[PDB]
């Protein structure tokens, strides 16, 4: 039996206290106005074991404790743990353990299973999730954490499913860490009757949920339904105005996500530069280049708390996500008077006669006080720095000119007379000194990124390669949604000719073995939704640009769509226009006044029954 589930089965995505918000989440939900299964009881059952794909939504309106159990398990025989929610009166508990559930899921003393095995985390929650009146429960599981819901609410007179909106309150979710592929329901029998098993299916589709300051959900849109409710979530609101708007490719939702960021597992000894025994001076520094590594910036702050850890260009907290190609590391030691002087654009003595960052520098400086490390009572003259030179320099101009400072008027060349000094000024370090003169060891990490295959990225793991399906790809930071195809393109074109003001990623370079991953849009078809406003009625239309009233069905993938939207993409009452094809209107041979500018001189209105019409812009 197939019925219609109209706006029922909405739960809370996250366990936060957001109030008066419009949060759009992407989890497993039940699409509105979808077909579900409804069975009864006879006196063994009415349907076999239903496949538990992602989640389950059970509805029941009976009483006297007829349906008070749920079975969850992969195979129920030599497998992982199984969820058993047995609702009782004196010893109502949730015994989550590995059992031997047979084919008969009859409650009524425990004849559901045969034997027990090793158990796991078991909840002892005495509050029973039991209470005409309709009982609805949403069971789901993600990241090894089974989530339960319950919205037992008084129901109206006898019917199949009540109207209105409901939000199942969050129950006591529990971590188990298993997988479920089969689902059953327990039934109680007095003499060893009828029941109402209402089972559905949860798909990973987007969902817009609006909250209230009182602490409850007022209304929510499925965002995977008729063009009106489809466009309702693209504007992040619950009301629309009279006019034609565009979609956001939310019809085909990306089921899976692929990352495939790294390709190696060997770590990187970048900490070997930070804990070096003897560093270098500012006069003659050494830049170490690293490539083909695995950068793990989380272990950077494992040392003593540093000072002035300002990372310009990138986010200091978000460092383990963006990839690069080369890692340059130059470390030296400066005085405490210039701890903040070393900065991009900040001028001074070291910005002129020493190392200096360019205008755009994605790397970061990291400095730590080393007063207890480099300090000599007589004087630490081994660490010096160039201060006296001819003129200014440019970034990355390491000079090792060991000559006499000769910017004066007369060529001293050894005598060191007027305007003649030593370039490398040897300033000493001593323990008995102030904090302003303490030595600070500073390393300048440089993250060089070129138009080359990735060599060193973040420490994230890898995913599976999914093909021929609308997925979400995040290979090398090009976070997008589409389908990956294997085209005959021998080389990957560099999309930089016309500066790519408005151009999407047509293809990506596979970080794994050499492949051609061309990116294709899942379903765009140039869909435009003409909403006359929810205040008037709930009837909209559709427009498709670049079709011939016959190619639109095979272009928007009408086969992989909801049955409610299929009727709005048929060949009936279609009209060929100079900008595409109009579907869902009646082309009137006459015109009165232009109200809704569909396009190319075509204007629509909403008059009487009340429906969308089609005409031209007569002047």
């Amino acid at each position, epitope marked *: 039996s197939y019925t219609n589930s109209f706006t029922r089965g909405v739960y809370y995505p996250d366990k936060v206290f957001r109030s008066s918000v419009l949060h759009s989440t992407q989890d497993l939900f039940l699409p509105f106005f979808s077909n579900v299964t409804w069975f009864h009881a006879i006196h063994r059952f009415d349907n076999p074991v239903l496949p538990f794909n992602d989640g389950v939504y059970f509805a029941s309106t009976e009483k006297s404790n007829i349906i008070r159990g749920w079975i969850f398990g992969t195979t129920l025989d030599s497998k992982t743990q199984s969820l058993l929610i047995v609702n009782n009166a004196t010893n109502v508990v949730i015994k989550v353990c590995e059992f031997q559930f047979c084919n008969d899921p009859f409650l009524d003393e425990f004849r559901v299973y045969s034997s027990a095995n090793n158990c796991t985390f078991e909840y002892v929650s005495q509050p029973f999730l039991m209470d005409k009146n309709l009982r609805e429960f949403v069971f789901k599981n993600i990241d090894g954490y089974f989530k339960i819901y319950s919205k037992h609410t008084p129901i109206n007179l006898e019917r199949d499913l009540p109207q209105g909106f409901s939000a199942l309150e969050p129950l006591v979710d529990l971590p188990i860490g298993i997988n479920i592929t089969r689902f059953q329901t327990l039934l109680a029998l007095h003499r060893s009757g009828a029941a109402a098993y209402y089972v559905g299916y949860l798909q990973p589709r987007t969902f817009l949920l609006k909250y209230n300051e009182n602490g409850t959900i007022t209304d929510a849109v499925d965002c995977a339904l008729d063009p009106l409710s489809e466009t309702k979530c693209t504007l992040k609101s619950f009301t629309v105005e009279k006019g034609i708007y565009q979609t956001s490719n939310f019809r085909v939702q990306p089921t899976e996500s692929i990352v495939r960021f790294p390709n190696i597992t060997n770590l990187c000894p970048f900490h070997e530069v930070f804990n070096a025994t003897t560093f270098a001076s500012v006069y003659a520094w050494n*830049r170490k*280049r690293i*490539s083909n590594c695995v950068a793990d910036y989380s272990v950077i702050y494992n040392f003593a708390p540093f000072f002035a850890f300002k990372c310009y*260009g990138v986010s200091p907290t978000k460092l383990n996500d963006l990839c690069f190609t*080369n890692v*340059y590391a130059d470390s030296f030691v400066i005085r405490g008077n210039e701890v903040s002087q070393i900065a991009p654009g900040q001028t001074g003595n070291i910005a002129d006669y020493n190392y200096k960052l*360019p205008d*755009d*520098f*994605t*790397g970061c400086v990291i400095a730590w006080n080393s007063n207890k490390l480099d300090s000599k009572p007589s004087g630490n003259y081994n660490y010096l720095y160039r201060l006296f030179r001819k003129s200014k320099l*440019k*970034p*990355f*101009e390491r000079d090792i000119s060991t000559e006499i400072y000769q910017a004066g008027n007369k060529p001293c060349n050894g005598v060191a007379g007027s305007n003649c000094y030593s370039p490398l000024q040897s300033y000493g370090f001593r323990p008995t000194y102030g904090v302003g003169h303490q030595p600070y060891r500073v390393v300048v990490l*440089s*993250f*060089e*990124l*070129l*138009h*080359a295959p990735a060599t060193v990225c973040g420490p994230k793991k890898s995913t599976n390669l999914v093909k021929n399906k609308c997925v979400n790809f995040n290979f090398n930071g090009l976070t997008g949604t589409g389908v990956l195809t294997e085209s005959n393109k021998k*080389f*990957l*074109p*560099f999309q*930089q*000719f016309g*500066r*790519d003001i408005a151009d999407t990623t047509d293809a990506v370079r596979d970080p794994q073995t*050499l492949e051609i991953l061309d990116i294709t849009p899942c379903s765009f078809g140039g869909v435009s939704v003409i909403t006359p406003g929810t205040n008037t009625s709930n009837q909209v239309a559709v427009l498709y640009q670049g079709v011939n009233c016959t190619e639109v069905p095979v272009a928007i993938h009408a086969d992989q769509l909801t049955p409610t939207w299929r009727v709005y993409s048929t060949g009936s009452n279609v009209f060929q226009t100079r900008a595409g094809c109009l579907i869902g209107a009646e082309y009137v041979n006459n015109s009165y006044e232009c109200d809704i500018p569909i396009g190319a001189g075509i204007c629509a209105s909403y008059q009487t029954s009340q429906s969308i019409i089609a005409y031209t812009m007569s002047l």
Partner: nanobody, 119 residues
Framework: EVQLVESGGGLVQPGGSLRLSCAASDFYFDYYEMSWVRQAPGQGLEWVSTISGLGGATYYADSVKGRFTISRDNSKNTLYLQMNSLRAEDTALYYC?????????????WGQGTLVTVS
């Protein structure tokens, strides 16, 4: 206000040797990296090789990896591309470009390009 002039090009034969030049006058940035690009009939543009300005890092494409060679001499500030063992799929317009390593993937400047026509 800078430019990248090129020199050298014409009809050649398969399995030969060719030298392409890329010079500049007002360009003095040391960290700006250099690169070559090729435009062939039918397709658009394809990257050939890249010399990083931070150090001595050189990188080639997948087809011209062990075939061509590059040399970025900073004494007179000029780039040279020596193409040996010219195959059939080498007739194209070659352009020299310069881009900053820190930033987007788009090239900062272009060149005049030379037509390498393999007989």
């Amino acid at each position: 206000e800078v430019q990248l002039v090129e020199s050298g090009g014409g009809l050649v034969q398969p399995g030969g040797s060719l030298r392409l030049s890329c010079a500049a006058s007002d360009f003095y940035f040391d960290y700006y990296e250099m690169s070559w690009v090729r435009q062939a009939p039918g397709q658009g543009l394809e990257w050939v090789s890249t010399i990083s300005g931070l150090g001595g890092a050189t990188y080639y494409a997948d087809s011209v990896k062990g075939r061509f060679t590059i040399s970025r001499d900073n004494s007179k500030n000029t780039l040279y591309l020596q193409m040996n063992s010219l195959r059939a799929e080498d007739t194209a317009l070659y352009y020299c470009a310069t881009r900053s390593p820190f930033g987007d993937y788009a090239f900062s400047y272009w060149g005049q390009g030379t037509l390498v026509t393999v007989s």
